[PDB]
Amino acid sequence: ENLYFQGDLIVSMRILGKKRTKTWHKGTLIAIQTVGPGKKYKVKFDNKGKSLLSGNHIAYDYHPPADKLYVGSRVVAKYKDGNQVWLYAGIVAETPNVKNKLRFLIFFDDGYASYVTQSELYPICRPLKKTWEDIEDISCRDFIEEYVTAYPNRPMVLLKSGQLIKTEWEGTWWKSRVEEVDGSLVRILFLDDKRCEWIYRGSTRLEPMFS
Numbered sequence: 001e002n003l004y005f006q007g008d009l010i011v012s013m014r015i016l017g018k019k020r021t022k023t024w025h026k027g028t029l030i031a032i033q034t035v036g037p038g039k040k041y042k043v044k045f046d047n048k049g050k051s052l053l054s055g056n057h058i059a060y061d062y063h064p065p066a067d068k069l070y071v072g073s074r075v076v077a078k079y080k081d082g083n084q085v086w087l088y089a090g091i092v093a094e095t096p097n098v099k100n101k102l103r104f105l106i107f108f109d110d111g112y113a114s115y116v117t118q119s120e121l122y123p124i125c126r127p128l129k130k131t132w133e134d135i136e137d138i139s140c141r142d143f144i145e146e147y148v149t150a151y152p153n154r155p156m157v158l159l160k161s162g163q164l165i166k167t168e169w170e171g172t173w174w175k176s177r178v179e180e181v182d183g184s185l186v187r188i189l190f191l192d193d194k195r196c197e198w199i200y201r202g203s204t205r206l207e208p209m210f211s
């Protein structure tokens, strides 16, 4: 059937949709279609394209209050490396507290981690019951499942700037150094190529956590 209404979704509403690039883009919900329990959402993207999307591949074009965001909430968050300024899917790992200076920790689907503010977050419209089950990468997916379900039990390694440690990259250990800690995140310098990465201090990519 064609629906005009589904939960708090209404045809002709402005919405974010997931493109095949895995980045999310502003569009218009132009149809809702049912097939038994199954629901699909037809989006007309503002620049280029129509897609027929699952409810977990559309996001509201508003910022939720803090009260509607939990550890495990499925979100789209802004990420910015220079002029590359894009919306990507992730999971809320941490809600605002004194220790994180009232920020949201996001674990992106691609294994990047970042603190963001409310103004950087959009809620996914129809997340899965197990929010993490639509993370394509199995190792990220299994990690987030364990993290979210054990929360607030979070083994983390206490690290200090200058500390020499082994960090995982593409399935091997690399000589590295702790450059900076910011709440639950450590900035690791890989000594081989002199590049940095922000890593969750409870990640098994940190050899001390792994052991």
Ligand SMILES: COc1cc2nc(NCCCCCN(C)C)nc(NCCCCCCN(C)C)c2cc1OC
Residues within 6 Å of the ligand: 079, 080, 081, 088, 108, 110, 112, 169, 174, 187, 190, 192, 193, 195, 196, 197, 198
């Ligand atoms: C803003 O500051 C940073 C931005 C970085 N951006 C990228 N890339 C852009 C891809 C974005 C992904 C999008 N996702 C979230 C959806 N990468 C970084 N570091 C890569 C690590 C290489 C280590 C390599 C180690 N050797 C041994 C191979 C970055 C570090 C940064 O801080 C120090």
